[PDB]
Symmetry: D2
Subunit: 349 residues, 4 copies
Amino acid sequence: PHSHPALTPEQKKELSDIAHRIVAPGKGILAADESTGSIAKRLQSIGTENTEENRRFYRQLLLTADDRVNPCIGGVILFHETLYQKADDGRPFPQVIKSKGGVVGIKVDKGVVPLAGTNGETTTQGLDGLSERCAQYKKDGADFAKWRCVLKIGEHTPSALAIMENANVLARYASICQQNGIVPIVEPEILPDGDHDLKRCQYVTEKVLAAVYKALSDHHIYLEGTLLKPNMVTPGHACTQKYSHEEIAMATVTALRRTVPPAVTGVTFLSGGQSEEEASINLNAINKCPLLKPWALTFSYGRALQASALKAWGGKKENLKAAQEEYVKRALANSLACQGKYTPSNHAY
Amino acid sequence: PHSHPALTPEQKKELSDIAHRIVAPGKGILAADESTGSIAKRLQSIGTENTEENRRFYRQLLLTADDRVNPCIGGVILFHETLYQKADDGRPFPQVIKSKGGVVGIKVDKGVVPLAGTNGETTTQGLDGLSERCAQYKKDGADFAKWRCVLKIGEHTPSALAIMENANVLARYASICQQNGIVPIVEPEILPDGDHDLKRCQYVTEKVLAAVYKALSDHHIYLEGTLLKPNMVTPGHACTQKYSHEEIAMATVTALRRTVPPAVTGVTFLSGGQSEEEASINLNAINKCPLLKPWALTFSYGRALQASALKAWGGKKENLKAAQEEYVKRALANSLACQGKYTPSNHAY
Amino acid sequence: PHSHPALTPEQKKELSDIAHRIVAPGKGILAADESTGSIAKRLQSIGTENTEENRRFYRQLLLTADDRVNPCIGGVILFHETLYQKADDGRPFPQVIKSKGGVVGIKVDKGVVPLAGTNGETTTQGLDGLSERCAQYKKDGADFAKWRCVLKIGEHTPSALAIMENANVLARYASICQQNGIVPIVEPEILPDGDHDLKRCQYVTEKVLAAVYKALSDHHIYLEGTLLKPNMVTPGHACTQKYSHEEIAMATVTALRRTVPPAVTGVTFLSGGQSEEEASINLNAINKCPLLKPWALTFSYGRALQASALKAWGGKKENLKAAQEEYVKRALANSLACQGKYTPNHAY
Amino acid sequence: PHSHPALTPEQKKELSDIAHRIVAPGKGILAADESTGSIAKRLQSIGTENTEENRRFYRQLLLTADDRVNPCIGGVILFHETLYQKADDGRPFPQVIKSKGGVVGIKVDKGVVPLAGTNGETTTQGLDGLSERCAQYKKDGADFAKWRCVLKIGEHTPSALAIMENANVLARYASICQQNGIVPIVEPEILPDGDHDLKRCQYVTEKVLAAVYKALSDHHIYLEGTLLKPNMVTPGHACTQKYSHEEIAMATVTALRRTVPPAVTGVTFLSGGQSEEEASINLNAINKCPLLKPWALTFSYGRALQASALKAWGGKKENLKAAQEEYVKRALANSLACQGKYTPSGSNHAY
Ligand SMILES: O=P(O)(O)Oc1ccc2cc(C(P(=O)(O)O)P(=O)(O)O)ccc2c1
Ligand SMILES: O=P(O)(O)Oc1ccc2cc(C(P(=O)(O)O)P(=O)(O)O)ccc2c1
Ligand SMILES: O=P(O)(O)Oc1ccc2cc(C(P(=O)(O)O)P(=O)(O)O)ccc2c1
Ligand SMILES: O=P(O)(O)Oc1ccc2cc(C(P(=O)(O)O)P(=O)(O)O)ccc2c1
């Protein structure tokens, strides 16, 4: 094969430097990039009207929490609307984030679409005009991006088509980001839905991540200028067999060691529906796993950072500080967890 | 693998019936889907201002040419703008086309974009929201679509990445079309640029089309409900070796026989920069090639149907009939050519 | 990609000419390449000892049937042992075959082996030293070869690995054959075992054959110098739903039309465990199917040509003529069937 | 996809334990598996007749070198013939190797064959009957195997076909070995021939290794029970641009970090035509490279361990001790090199 380099040394340095800042020791990501339809559910859960101002205020509440979160938060993923909103003091939210030591991220996918001829499987759209969007987002303060693909474990899923196509579109997204100075977070989420056990999740995760990294290679992606946002390896939500956090950690770290090249700068786990505590305990067990882990293992959490804060807020401005305190408590917990410092046989894998 | 049928028998019948109508014996396609920027080059060549009204009048001139074209024209590919324009008598252009026995087609890609890490290679964008666009276009009178991928022959091209990715995006586009009752024309154009010879073009065409049909299989595409729009197999533009039309025909038909399943309903060749006469003579020779050809071999021509008509028009309303006459003459010529009736060893392939 | 031609025009002409001779109109293939272990079961079924001489005599019985078979038999696939055996008159069996207008073929695979990490799936071995073996078989009178891959329909099979790997090894085998003047018959057999229905067999057959032809493209195989030996598309053995021969034919031809490039010179169906009559009726229906079929559709039959002959023989020399007559009858039947002359769609 | 496990936990433990023993800190591999035709060239260069006894004597000279080599040699790759030969005292050579702390390996490929339709590219044969051969070799004392694929950098090579096919056959070989308790060393050698530069070798090495590990995944290979034997990343032999050992090290380690999952137990470099000292200096620089390296980085050397010993021997029995001393000296040097402790005394964004 013949090299026509995708990136200059200067471009590589920029991307690697950004990626490393996001996942520096003790740091993880606040995933605050819920679309309006997704944040509508959460505001509904606290009897709060889904208005642009309430969304602004709620995002403000998280982003302006006090300086205790600064060493915990290496990056914040925003939804488009929020990237262009301002705090009460008039500061653009990206400036707020940066002033606290955080890197600003932007979700750029345009959601899932059905794959015809599959058993309810999807790919993800959003490539059209993405290069121009990335150039604009970079000018407007974002240095990394997020794109979510979704796979499901079932009798006939994930299919060969779903694995190949989601890996391929992730690679296209990553390529476009890197041409524009944006670090792509590659998110091939395997949902926990179903009654499958831990070893089945581990098996599917291994196959998916092998496909992801082959596609990234085929598309000439610079891995040092990327992050990976995978599911932890867990039993299915409905699995009747029970597992310890140490078993979840061993399956997760084993799957990653078998598939993720050491050049990848970091792994920022999604927590899906895990409780706030569950997500911290699992991340902590992952970091205590006694296998060699050549990448940062940290968090990219939404509900696992926000659930208690949202409830404490309750849509009432006078609950601001109480709500922020709940978020700080989870930021501190997960900052400890991504160092193996949180307290509330590998051949079998 | 497990079947979760992409299409019902009723959906398949609709797509197969449309595809067969377009390429019925003696019929081919007027490719009139030049974007505003693309048609600008045309109108500039005749000192005509690139306004919507001038574009409307020119498209009208072609679409309302007299009834002699009806048995020649099985389909017309339109650009979005034109699908929603009307002739002077108030008739929507899709109604004009249908009243003359033509199927209405719509170009749906959003142009090429660069593949990072390649020697100037591209893929094509346009999948975002494509399902909704197809449903709307179907409602508004279109029954087939076009999507153009572009590959180039050079020292290191087409690369494995470019072949793989362009084949994959063609398959996604085809899948989405078929879910919405739209027959996709799959266009993997290999440009004739360069100094390569006929056998190099044949080799690359064979490899590209094998990749295209494997991707269509992987994505569960119903081939009977598709058409193929390939390059003919020709020497490169800068090649100094001379070849006969019979050699071009043999290389073209051999390449297609080696790659295109008989289930594909028809092949509608692009002619690129070929002269009007060259494109007709080549197509005629292709149809006279003594090898077995289990698909229709016809035309999807732009300049090869329009060049003399555009010149005779000159932007002047009073040249209407003179311009229409030149177009009619080429429609008649190519209708004969796609039957092997136009007049102005295989182991070596 | 860059062309470094696998084959010269002269090499291509040789392979295309051989391939076309084998499947010329009215002609099919006698598949007589059973391993000794497979033919043992057969000789036992007629109380005949599985000796070298009894195998020789049985193969002689088929190969020296009278000249009525000549327009029926375009090729005969032999097992190694038989390629080097002689008829009673001293003629090598390849000379016997050629003297009757047949092309001689040689089975070259060395059987299936298990794919670790699968649910009982296999690939096929036999590439080692294959080039030198082909060169020798060519000198010894063979002009085509056969290699059998085996796939199974089940809840999780055929797996992506099994499809990928069997397609790849077929392509390697085909490539080596073509370098040595041998036409490869590519046999990706999907077993009929199981209770799946006709559309499931059609779906799997379509996916397998697409993978096969992509692998053949990747390995620079000259399709005009090949033949395909697939399963017909049928319900599984244990399927309770019943289908007509016209439905089997439509599914089979549709699957082939969706995957087999017109450049492939011919399709020579295996019949497996189908009765002699069933195999003829199905092949006839395939050829009467009213879709366009740009390749020869004929037979590569073993038991469907041999079953009644084996019975009439019974291991007894005095039944030679009676046994040969049964074989001739099936050769004639299948010669008619591969022309659509034998008498005893959007839903696809 | 559905798991029908290729290996039990016990089988995995056996393979992982073997793999780790071979590449334990300070240890590398003596690659002594030259076929009869290949060793003929070596013996002629010292005017010695290529007889079975001379081959036995030469292999004995290496395998019975004194105990200084024991902490240096974690594994020895043998050719079939040698696996069944005995030392002068009657001990089978596998017992000799084991008694000195080494794991016994067996080369199981049957050589390269040409890929039709390529510019002189090859794949490698040897799968036929390989399972039975592996079971027999395991019984007869071998615990790991070697299989060599060869790729070339040129105008149109390595081609997509060559990359795909060599990766696939390596995966088949690895699968069969692991079913029989044999650790497969996966060797996708990219030859150094040609005038390409360092960044071109790095690029091709990255693409080849990504294909290798995708194939191993597709074939359900247990990476912890494997080793990798790649080329170092170097300029081509005819390249006119000069590079430092630190640049070679950086390019090599970067390429591996970008493709080799951390689960792989170790990387045992081939040295090709590098001189004895060059192969040690480069391996040492690789181990001093200031990037994170989550696998052992050690040697699987033939000529780089044998060249001076072969010369000092000269086919003369009376030169035995002198010849063994030269081998010991290279074993000691490379044991230091694979720890980054070798001395002659005894920007990464640019990649
Ligand atoms: O609304 P969409 O446009 O589809 O975008 C999404 C989709 C899923 C998300 C999940 C999270 C968290 P969760 O709160 O734990 O679910 P996770 O850590 O990434 O899983 C956060 C933000 C998300 C945004
Ligand atoms: O402007 P774009 O949006 O990119 O869309 C295009 C691009 C190329 C085209 C080529 C043709 C003819 P040609 O006039 O002979 O070149 P062909 O037969 O398809 O080659 C016709 C219409 C085209 C429209
Ligand atoms: O013993 P092996 O070495 O594995 O080789 C084989 C395997 C299957 C065979 C099947 C047939 C006939 P069948 O008698 O109808 O089954 P088919 O027409 O090819 O199916 C003929 C010869 C065969 C030889
Ligand atoms: O003769 P074959 O059957 O083909 O088997 C081979 C081929 C190449 C070899 C190279 C080496 C050394 P080298 O002596 O340095 O070349 P490397 O370190 O593995 O390169 C050692 C043993 C070899 C054996």
